[PDB]
Design an enzyme around this catalytic site. Structure first.
Site, PDB file in Angstrom:
ATOM      1  N   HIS D  21      13.372 -13.225  11.389  1.00  0.00           N
ATOM      2  CA  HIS D  21      14.136 -14.424  11.059  1.00  0.00           C
ATOM      3  C   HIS D  21      13.370 -15.272  10.050  1.00  0.00           C
ATOM      4  O   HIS D  21      13.076 -16.440  10.307  1.00  0.00           O
ATOM      5  CB  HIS D  21      14.407 -15.248  12.317  1.00  0.00           C
ATOM      6  N   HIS D  77      25.649  -4.856  18.243  1.00  0.00           N
ATOM      7  CA  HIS D  77      25.158  -6.063  17.596  1.00  0.00           C
ATOM      8  C   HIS D  77      25.015  -5.786  16.103  1.00  0.00           C
ATOM      9  O   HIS D  77      24.406  -4.792  15.709  1.00  0.00           O
ATOM     10  CB  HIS D  77      23.806  -6.445  18.202  1.00  0.00           C
ATOM     11  N   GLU D  79      23.447  -7.437  13.671  1.00  0.00           N
ATOM     12  CA  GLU D  79      22.320  -8.031  12.960  1.00  0.00           C
ATOM     13  C   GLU D  79      21.552  -6.955  12.186  1.00  0.00           C
ATOM     14  O   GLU D  79      21.496  -5.799  12.605  1.00  0.00           O
ATOM     15  CB  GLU D  79      21.402  -8.783  13.926  1.00  0.00           C
ATOM     16  N   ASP D  81      18.688  -5.883  11.855  1.00  0.00           N
ATOM     17  CA  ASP D  81      17.665  -5.063  12.497  1.00  0.00           C
ATOM     18  C   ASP D  81      18.253  -3.941  13.354  1.00  0.00           C
ATOM     19  O   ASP D  81      17.515  -3.112  13.890  1.00  0.00           O
ATOM     20  CB  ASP D  81      16.693  -5.924  13.317  1.00  0.00           C
ATOM     21  N   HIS D 145      22.775 -12.431  22.011  1.00  0.00           N
ATOM     22  CA  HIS D 145      22.606 -13.801  21.538  1.00  0.00           C
ATOM     23  C   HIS D 145      23.600 -14.199  20.444  1.00  0.00           C
ATOM     24  O   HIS D 145      23.615 -15.349  20.004  1.00  0.00           O
ATOM     25  CB  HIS D 145      21.176 -14.003  21.035  1.00  0.00           C
ATOM     26  N   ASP D 164      19.647  -6.142  22.436  1.00  0.00           N
ATOM     27  CA  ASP D 164      18.569  -7.129  22.411  1.00  0.00           C
ATOM     28  C   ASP D 164      18.104  -7.541  23.807  1.00  0.00           C
ATOM     29  O   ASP D 164      16.903  -7.660  24.058  1.00  0.00           O
ATOM     30  CB  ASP D 164      18.995  -8.371  21.624  1.00  0.00           C
ATOM     31  N   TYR D 192       9.786 -13.314  23.950  1.00  0.00           N
ATOM     32  CA  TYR D 192      11.099 -13.090  23.359  1.00  0.00           C
ATOM     33  C   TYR D 192      12.131 -14.061  23.918  1.00  0.00           C
ATOM     34  O   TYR D 192      12.798 -14.772  23.165  1.00  0.00           O
ATOM     35  CB  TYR D 192      11.555 -11.648  23.594  1.00  0.00           C
ATOM     36  N   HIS D 225      15.059  -2.884  21.374  1.00  0.00           N
ATOM     37  CA  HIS D 225      13.692  -3.201  20.977  1.00  0.00           C
ATOM     38  C   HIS D 225      12.719  -2.830  22.089  1.00  0.00           C
ATOM     39  O   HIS D 225      12.846  -3.301  23.220  1.00  0.00           O
ATOM     40  CB  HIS D 225      13.550  -4.694  20.664  1.00  0.00           C
TER      41      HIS D 225
HETATM   42  C1  LIG Z   1      18.397 -17.084  15.597  1.00  0.00           C
HETATM   43  C2  LIG Z   1      19.721 -17.330  14.937  1.00  0.00           C
HETATM   44  C3  LIG Z   1      20.482 -18.438  15.289  1.00  0.00           C
HETATM   45  C4  LIG Z   1      21.708 -18.664  14.677  1.00  0.00           C
HETATM   46  N1  LIG Z   1      22.459 -19.766  15.034  1.00  0.00           N
HETATM   47  C5  LIG Z   1      23.677 -19.994  14.427  1.00  0.00           C
HETATM   48  C6  LIG Z   1      24.438 -21.101  14.782  1.00  0.00           C
HETATM   49  O1  LIG Z   1      24.027 -21.884  15.637  1.00  0.00           O
HETATM   50  N2  LIG Z   1      25.655 -21.320  14.169  1.00  0.00           N
HETATM   51  C7  LIG Z   1      26.115 -20.443  13.208  1.00  0.00           C
HETATM   52  O2  LIG Z   1      27.200 -20.639  12.665  1.00  0.00           O
HETATM   53  N3  LIG Z   1      25.364 -19.341  12.856  1.00  0.00           N
HETATM   54  C8  LIG Z   1      24.147 -19.113  13.460  1.00  0.00           C
HETATM   55  N4  LIG Z   1      23.396 -18.014  13.098  1.00  0.00           N
HETATM   56  C9  LIG Z   1      23.925 -17.069  12.060  1.00  0.00           C
HETATM   57  C10 LIG Z   1      23.308 -17.323  10.690  1.00  0.00           C
HETATM   58  O3  LIG Z   1      23.497 -18.668  10.321  1.00  0.00           O
HETATM   59  C11 LIG Z   1      23.968 -16.413   9.666  1.00  0.00           C
HETATM   60  O4  LIG Z   1      23.530 -15.095   9.904  1.00  0.00           O
HETATM   61  C12 LIG Z   1      23.618 -16.813   8.239  1.00  0.00           C
HETATM   62  O5  LIG Z   1      24.450 -16.117   7.342  1.00  0.00           O
HETATM   63  C13 LIG Z   1      22.175 -16.463   7.914  1.00  0.00           C
HETATM   64  O6  LIG Z   1      21.773 -17.194   6.779  1.00  0.00           O
HETATM   65  P1  LIG Z   1      20.383 -16.849   6.046  1.00  0.00           P
HETATM   66  O7  LIG Z   1      20.200 -15.352   5.991  1.00  0.00           O
HETATM   67  O8  LIG Z   1      20.427 -17.391   4.641  1.00  0.00           O
HETATM   68  O9  LIG Z   1      19.241 -17.474   6.811  1.00  0.00           O
HETATM   69  C14 LIG Z   1      22.178 -17.782  13.709  1.00  0.00           C
HETATM   70  C15 LIG Z   1      21.414 -16.674  13.358  1.00  0.00           C
HETATM   71  C16 LIG Z   1      20.188 -16.448  13.971  1.00  0.00           C
HETATM   72  C17 LIG Z   1      19.362 -15.254  13.592  1.00  0.00           C
HETATM   73 FE   LIG Z   2      19.725  -9.804  17.456  1.00  0.00          FE
HETATM   74 FE   LIG Z   3      17.470  -7.466  17.589  1.00  0.00          FE
END
Ligand SMILES: Cc1cc2nc3c(=O)[nH]c(=O)nc-3n(C[C@H](O)[C@H](O)[C@H](O)COP(=O)(O)O)c2cc1C
Ligand SMILES: [Fe+3]
Ligand SMILES: [Fe+3]
Ligand SMILES: Cc1cc2nc3c(=O)[nH]c(=O)nc-3n(C[C@H](O)[C@H](O)[C@H](O)COP(=O)(O)O)c2cc1C
Ligand SMILES: Cc1cc2nc3c(=O)[nH]c(=O)nc-3n(C[C@H](O)[C@H](O)[C@H](O)COP(=O)(O)O)c2cc1C
Ligand SMILES: Cc1cc2nc3c(=O)[nH]c(=O)nc-3n(C[C@H](O)[C@H](O)[C@H](O)COP(=O)(O)O)c2cc1C
Ligand SMILES: [Fe+3]
Ligand SMILES: [Fe+3]
Ligand SMILES: [Fe+3]
Ligand SMILES: [Fe+3]
Ligand SMILES: [Fe+3]
Ligand SMILES: [Fe+3]
Lengths: 398, 398, 398, 398
Positions: D21, D77, D79, D81, D145, D164, D192, D225
């Site tokens: 992140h 998921h 994401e 990763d 998450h 996760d 974690y 993971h």
């Molecule tokens: C740990 C984490 C927390 C996040 N919390 C929110 C959130 O509260 N609200 C939301 O709309 N997106 C949330 N996201 C999604 C990110 O905002 C989204 O993936 C965004 O496109 C990432 O932007 P960036 O790659 O420029 O940092 C979260 C993502 C991560 C990894």
């Molecule tokens: Fe994840």
């Molecule tokens: Fe993950």
């Protein structure tokens, strides 16, 4: 603050510190500097603290006792982390006699430049009466870790002020060993020995044998760093004997440096080949550029064998590997086996020079592993096989 | 995005990048990767970009031209920062012929593992017609900096695609040299040459002499990193000749490592002795543990002399000095003088081994400076005098 | 070491230092601490050095003059980097009278805890005769940068000891401004003002106007950090007036933080849109996690507008953005415009809270830019257009 | 590589990785990405790996099975990763049906931009026959998450692919939980949860209650993971219930930032006051500028109370404190108590704004501690007393 009876801890906890010896020893859990004030008929101060805390030290010592009431000063080790507040203190009580080894006189002067101070040379077996039927028995311990190092034994209370030995850099508000987290404590004890005491392992067993030969009771071992060994003191002594005997576990450490991840791919494959061949072995991989150096050396210390990696850069090794090999030569690990490996572009030559230096460092060398550019599927099969073959050659008896 | 006429910049700016070659070359102003699309009768692509941007590259190339319309691909250098998007591209147009040196075939295969690709070996003087009276003339440049390196000349437009040569890692939204900050630009050009091209200086003058001997006009020099030399192109060429001739200014660099700041005190004194003796000399001091390594080497490159420092640790040098000396041996600086210095506790020996290695690296050695423990007022007078004596011996003619 | 006539530089060069104010101000070229000994009929010491060099300071001062011969001590600023060697010095000559502002008494006591010292409050216009027809004229300068700050003017020699003001953290063996590298010098002067003096810009012009209103000649300006302004002293004064007037160049700074590079892609696009629309504008991009914070703030200072970026993380901003916005609120930049932008996953909300805080910081806000997940080709067209629109709105007159 | 029967681990170990992140989650023991290939009558692939290893992934998957033989793809998921190698894979087998939540369709498209892919929405209780009497039962877990998160249960083998959840970033060559070092394993599990799952603790107990309510046997829990929970799987489940219930130990964490170590001195004193008053309490001190942020948050998670420190800088807090408070607001710790403290020079105000924000973050606030400049002996007595008073107020029942 009170160690035992009339023995008072008057040291300094350091939660923020991260660097020791420049940056050669990183302390991720901070540290502490132990100074002990013993007050019987004679008031004696045992060591000071790091020079960075000289002001806080003297002031705190005032709140404990009037400086003029201090009769003797004992300096076991003249390194800045233990004698750094000595000048600022001796400026208030210049006539106070100091007790140390002959070598300490040389090292204390080399730091403070006050040859007029009242030095009193002590040798093994020497005593210093402090009243109430108690005395200080000195035990020289040269090259553990400095030529000036020694230990002080307090009769009656049976307290052994060992200074650096048996210590660890682990900052905690509690003083005694049985009061702190056991795992973090021992992880730090082992990290200390491996990074600082390894080159002098040969002197540990004879020295510890000598001290025990004095038939002295030990209720406590009060080091200059970290906790006071109150609960089962010989605990840490047994460990040092274990560690000093060319210590090794069923473990293999693999470290390297890389410019385009080619040597990394070889490292990963070798590991898979090991884990697949001998399940008993614990494997560890580190990129010297992206890792804690002291953690690497701790593992090496714990390891039966090592695989060091590097690519060829300008007809030579990579800097961080060259430097890390230089340090290992100094730490002089014993009874360990090793294997060099790496990638190259055209002429190469770095793996060969790495292999020779590893041997001069005291490692028993195995066959080297070489690849050109990025290892393809065929080359990767060779790298895994290298891991298997190494795992078989180094395997411990069933 | 448009370089000149039908030559289109289709590269990738990298503002965030800090590490090159692992961490051996740190780029504090980011970088850029230049790829050029030339469209006449034949559509030819010159180099790709860093592997980290392979997806963005192909996509952006689609928005510029349909992939099938690409006729030829020219690869001057097969390093990941220029040919990293080649696999992802060749997967869309597998039959496209590639033009490179014989060595590039070896290096491209070593990275991508696709020996079936239609390679076409080119040599110096070889041409490739692209229609409209224009052609590509190839110029091999082995070991500048890789065995596979070459340059491509575009007739008519008079554009020399030199790849790494004449480039610099300096990220900017403007493409042309006259559009960016001049000081930052040149600071980065010199930083590049010193850290990567130094070991191959002997090949620079003959190579540049050869190219000029072709009597070809050069309106632009389009490198693979940073700006396109549009305004007074030979500008950067004149510099390379200057830099390749065992370059040195009236400057002295002093670097060292230290555990308790003793060697630091010697370094500071030596500097004061130099500055006091010869005002013409620019002095620089660096702690290898607390400094940018590439900045140290740039200064060394710019220096007529160097003073390297170290204390003794476990009978050997300090790791970061050992590693930095290893790298210098590889960079092979020429016509520079040096002096070793440091402190020690008892037996010492690190200054002597440091001095020998500096000599094997190609430095003309002067007398060493040695001190025990912390230099007192007397020892400091010696250290300043060492600075003065060095300043006199190395002084340039009036 | 000799500044002018009987004025002797007795300060301390610091080549190794990297951290100031914890880590809030990083000094990449080290620093120096200036202390001046003036010896006429009366021997007067002007400021000391950083507490880390207290031992070297006193000792070096002894080699210059017997401590008892010091008549007066002048303290312009009671911060540790200038008054850190005051306790160690006053311990040798406790009765020596000190001259400072009323606020300095409060700040000196708050550091050294010696209220018994002979303090002598001075105000603007106050004088202190030192014999030979020369005197010291004091000039209070509260909140430049501390409530206790002041300047000292030496009659005859026409030397203005300004302390922090007009200084810069740039370590060099040469003392005078005309002896050092001009570009590095000015880069450091501007870096200093932007990171420390910005919040007090309103006080600069009136203060400098007042000093000039005294009709005093200035042959030299001797700061407490870096070079002595010997050659064309008003040089640096003219700059401060320029810098204090809500300074801005035709420049735009873009910084952000990102977890998966989505916000980065938006940043890159916005930049391309700006550079393509208005060639006069210099664009800069920074990742707050991978960049020098002070460099970001220097650019912001130099900028007419800023674009701050962040994704949504746990319904809030990203920590490093929140922290950097907190610092900007404190530095209070003026007459600058800004625009927030970022990506999000579902509910978002971080761009909106970032935009509000930027406004409360004193920035004139423009429309925000928002994207979901990774910006595809369509979203990227919007991001470039946002760059163009911003470039048009902020464009300077033809 | 073989998990159980026809379930094959086809993931990627990552020894070098340190940043997740961006830099918001540092992984000091590397990580791994688990992908599982299940081959019965139907060949099904469960998740992919990090985008950085897309090439190695596909290739390794080829060596395991012909791509065309893959019938279904399950994405728990989306994401990077876990779904970073999805585009490179779907380019070889574009027609392969994907199974995921409705939200995953939104998140997968937002990353890969391929809406034409054959998505198949699944809900809790949905099944997917794979032959041999075995089927896949899906369990949605939104906001654990991500909104798109879910789990997959394999009938017969009784394997729960949780992604996760129940995972940890701990790189090891051994796959199963009983094969790795237990202490390092659990230290990483807790690290974690505290840094990523804390804000969603309220959803954990109901979700885990629901899954158990399905009366399904669980021989193994295979996360995305780290290790596969083979030996006593519910082990990690019991922990999550424990952790989700506003978890706290008898521990107090103290962190702060400081420019001249004044706030540090207050912190040290407060600690001594706590340790002296209530021996049951474990105390931890951290400098946010010199410490691992994730380690601080883990302790906070484990703590019943917190003391945050800061000095006043430009009328505001210090950046790193402001940023760290921003993150805590997002993590939303519950049932914890806190106290603000710090030093200031004149007007101050930072402790008050720090205290308010800590309260808005969900902390039950105690009295603040304030000091001016450097705390003298008197001020230090107040700081220790503050430690004692806090220790009494927060003390757990006898
Ligand atoms: C740990 C984490 C927390 C996040 N919390 C929110 C959130 O509260 N609200 C939301 O709309 N997106 C949330 N996201 C999604 C990110 O905002 C989204 O993936 C965004 O496109 C990432 O932007 P960036 O790659 O420029 O940092 C979260 C993502 C991560 C990894
Ligand atoms: Fe994840
Ligand atoms: Fe993950
Ligand atoms: C700066 C640099 C210098 C190099 N020098 C040599 C060399 O002297 N001899 C050689 O055979 N290959 C040389 N190479 C090629 C690398 O050794 C080759 O690319 C190797 O596969 C990279 O290994 P790695 O990615 O694991 O670091 C050099 C590469 C670079 C980038
Ligand atoms: C870990 C360690 C190892 C040392 N090893 C040696 C040694 O092998 N031989 C020696 O003469 N001095 C040795 N010393 C003493 C140092 O060289 C001595 O203190 C020197 O003055 C320190 O120099 P520096 O502060 O500039 O690093 C060692 C010191 C330390 C801390
Ligand atoms: C750059 C800077 C800005 C400061 N701003 C303020 C301020 O706005 N208000 C105040 O009362 N003190 C201010 N101070 C004074 C500090 O708060 C004071 O020295 C404090 O005791 C330092 O605490 P610390 O050493 O724990 O960081 C400032 C100090 C510095 C160096
Ligand atoms: Fe020691
Ligand atoms: Fe020690
Ligand atoms: Fe290259
Ligand atoms: Fe390149
Ligand atoms: Fe200041
Ligand atoms: Fe200052």
């Amino acid at each position: 603050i009170v160690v035992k009876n009339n023995i008072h801890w008057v040291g300094q906890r350091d939660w923020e510190v991260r660097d020791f010896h420049g940056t050669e020893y990183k302390t991720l859990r901070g540290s502490s500097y132990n100074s002990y004030l013993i007050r019987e008929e004679k008031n004696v101060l045992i060591d000071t603290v790091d020079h960075k805390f000289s002001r806080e030290f003297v002031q705190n010592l005032r709140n404990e006792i009037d400086l003029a009431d201090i009769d003797y000063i004992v300096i076991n080790h003249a390194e800045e982390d233990h004698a750094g507040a000595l000048t600022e203190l001796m400026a208030q009580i210049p006539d106070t006699p100091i007790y140390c080894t002959a070598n300490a006189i040389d090292s204390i002067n080399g730091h403070h430049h006050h040859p007029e101070w009242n030095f009193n040379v002590v040798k093994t077996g020497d005593t210093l009466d402090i009243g109430n039927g108690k005395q200080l028995i000195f035990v020289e311990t040269p090259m553990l870790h400095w030529p000036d190092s020694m230990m002080t034994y307090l009769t009656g209370d049976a307290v052994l002020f060992s200074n650096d030995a048996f210590g660890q850099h682990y900052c905690d508000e509690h003083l005694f060993n049985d009061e702190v987290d056991q795992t973090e404590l021992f992880e730090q004890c082992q990290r200390y020995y491996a990074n600082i005491l390894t080159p002098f392992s040969r002197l540990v067993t004879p020295k510890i044998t000598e001290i025990l030969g004095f038939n002295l009771p030990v209720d406590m071992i009060a080091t200059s760093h970290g906790v006071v060994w109150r609960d089962n003191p010989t605990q840490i002594v047994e460990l040092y004997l274990k560690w000093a005997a060319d210590y090794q576990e069923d473990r293999i450490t693999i470290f390297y440096d890389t410019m385009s991840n080619n040597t990394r791919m070889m490292a990963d494959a070798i590991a898979q080949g090991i884990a697949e061949t001998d399940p008993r072995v614990a494997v560890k991989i580190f990129n010297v550029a992206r890792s804690d150096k002291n953690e690497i050396l701790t593992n090496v210390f714990r390891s039966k064998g090592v695989l060091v990696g590097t690519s060829t850069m300008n007809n030579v090794m990579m800097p961080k590997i060259a430097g890390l090999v230089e340090e290992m030569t100094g730490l002089r690990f014993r009874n360990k086996r090793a294997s060099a490996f790496g990638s190259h572009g055209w002429s190469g030559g770095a793996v060969d020079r790495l292999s020779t230096r590893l041997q001069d460092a005291g490692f028993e060398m195995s066959l080297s592993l070489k690849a050109k550019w990025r290892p393809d599927q065929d080359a990767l099969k060779l790298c895994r096989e290298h891991g298997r073959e190494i795992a078989r050659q180094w395997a411990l008896a069933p």
